[PDB]
């Protein structure tokens with residue numbers, strides 16, 4: 001998160017860190033045994049870290065749970081970047097409390113202009129490299145499909161949305177991948193990709209979660 | 224007036240330093256350049272120039288940039304590219320970039336010779352830089368094709384790969 005702010009501890013209790021020896025992707029807790037993330041975050045072995053605020057210092061009340069099942073979307077293509085969504089089944093249900101909680105799936109798509117909250121542990125520099133230990137936050141509007149398609153001509157499918165600022169300065173970045181874009185208590189976006197970080201007319205691109213609610217509920221109930 | 228190529232911290236490129244080649248794109252179309260096995264390649268050593276399918280897993284194989292002369296690295300100046308990794312003598316040449324309309328980038332080249340493959344770093348139309356292959360305007364933009372499902376670097380004069388150089 002470039003140009004964001006440090007979230008108040010445990011104010012984003014659905015946020016998770018995916019760990020493969022190190023933090024590498026965010027995700028969101030949608031029920032006690034399932035996390036949603038981006039497909040480009042697929043890895044054969046994943047440790048899910050819940051209730052995390054400082055990812056570099058074990059406080060004591062985090063939950064570390066290995067993934068039992070890692071399901072990428074069956075029509076995900078890693079070079080069209082379409083259908084960049086993934087489900088992770090926890091090898092044991094997580095304990096829900098004030099630090100670890102679920103976020104609701106969308107019950108409608110989010111209109112342009114809606115204020116959303118993005119969060120993650122990715123880069124905070126537009127150019128260099130400055131990765132935080134503490135979860136970062138940014139409030140940003142959903143952009144119009146018109147302005148999103150003008151910023152990324154010929155790259156936006158019907159399954160992506162742009163969130164952020166045409167002017168630049170505030171944006172998600174490398175390592176926020178797979179993290180949540182929560183909009184009126186509803187998970188509407190998954191950090192997917194961008195061109196540079198917080199550059200003018202280059203907002204972050206997010207998987208449009210409302211296009212996947214059926215797949216999520218059905219894949220969860222079948223596995 | 225010669226314009227030095229800059230790393231991701233604004234510092235000019237140094238032929239004594241190592242850099243990862245990173246995508247201007249991040250996330251799902253991030254992915255640093257690395258040295259990989261070409262499909263059905265006879266070499267005992269990895270011989271292809273690839274890039275990862277995302278920037279959330281392994282980091283780039285580091286490279287160095289050998290200028291044909293001087294000790295700076297300038298835009299539009301000829302140079303060779305070599306992955307900088309521990310390897311036995313047999314695979315040294317297989318760390319050195321060379322080119323094999325679509326032409327795949329491979330290793331197996333030589334450095335600073337008449338038979339070597341020279342490249343130029345030029346400013347990108349958007350952010351960052353492109354690499355040019357220059358068989359010594361008649362150079363050729365370096366981009367990506369998909370080969371057995373992997374991102375393989377290749378000559379493509381539509382849609383070059385916009386890159387930055389992050390020092391190791």
Ligand SMILES: [Ca+2]
Nearest residue numbers: 054057058059
């Ligand atoms: Ca911690």
